[PDB]
């Protein structure tokens, strides 16, 4: 569960990401595919090569979803309901893989926004991404 300070932190770091969210979301995906190649098995029909336009379009979707999780940080199960049905009921993503994408996202943000990636922010981003991961891995109603 997030503290109130966690929420302020995430709202303000992700606010600074702004209009690079799409570009960071693509880079995080590309890090995940290179560093943990088993995650490519979920994307069998994609061009996964470097600079692929399909990975860059998927990174925009992932990022835009994270933007909405932030705007609804108090009621995430409800805001992320269709995503939860896609990842838990239809795709059946093993939960281990959410820890890999989350790590790749943190790494992308550290490399791009070093002045914002303080220890306190790092801690709050990590807890937010774990709470998003839990919503998406759960079959609920």
């Amino acid at each position: 569960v997030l503290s109130p300070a966690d929420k302020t932190n995430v709202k303000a770091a992700w606010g600074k990401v702004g209009a690079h969210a799409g570009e960071y979301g693509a880079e995080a995906l590309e890090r995940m595919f290179l560093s943990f190649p088993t995650t490519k098995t979920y994307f069998p029909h994609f061009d996964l090569s470097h600079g692929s336009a399909q990975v860059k379009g998927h990174g925009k979707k992932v990022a835009d979803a994270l933007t909405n999780a932030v705007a609804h940080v108090d009621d995430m199960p409800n805001a992320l309901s269709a995503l939860s049905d896609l990842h838990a009921h239809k795709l059946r993503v093993d939960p281990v893989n959410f820890k890999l994408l989350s790590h790749c996202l943190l790494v992308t943000l550290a490399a791009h926004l070093p002045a914002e990636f303080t220890p306190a922010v790092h801690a709050s981003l990590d807890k937010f991404l774990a709470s998003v991961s839990t919503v998406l891995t759960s079959k609920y109603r």
Partner: protein
């Protein structure tokens, strides 16, 4: 496990790490981001806030020791088990550190290198370091 061109990428970026500082920054961040790891450093004094942890001298000093050990592993990337044997005994027999935590420290170290090198910590450089830190975590787990 590491290709000759990813052993070289790893050594080049490691020759630029501030060995007095990065180790502390990583151990610091572990204690802030995963707060139950503080239980094992109860003798280090004040760990009460992120500011306290990051400025604690004994955290800074222990992080130099841990980074010392990763550098030892990076010199012996074949024979990591033999490099880390004594340290596996210590972390288990004496400290009782659950091995999932070894994985967490390696990932935090990856984020600290991302944070220091920025654009030059490219996806292929990150992937070589992920192989390196998984190696160290496996060698340490008893």
């Amino acid at each position: 496990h590491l290709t000759p061109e990813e052993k070289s990428a790893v050594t080049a970026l490691w020759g630029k790490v501030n060995v007095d500082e990065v180790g502390g920054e990583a151990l610091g961040r572990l204690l802030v981001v995963y707060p139950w790891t503080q239980r094992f450093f109860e003798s280090f004094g004040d760990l009460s806030t992120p500011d306290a942890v990051m400025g604690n001298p004994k955290v800074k000093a222990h992080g130099k020791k841990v980074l010392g050990a990763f550098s030892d592993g990076l010199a012996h990337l074949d024979n990591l088990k033999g490099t880390f044997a004594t340290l596996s005994e210590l972390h288990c027999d004496k400290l009782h550190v659950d091995p999932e935590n070894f994985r967490l420290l390696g990932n935090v170290l990856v984020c600290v290198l991302a944070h220091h090198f920025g654009k030059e910590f490219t996806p292929p450089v990150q992937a070589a370091y992920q192989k390196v830190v998984a190696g160290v975590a496996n060698a340490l787990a008893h």
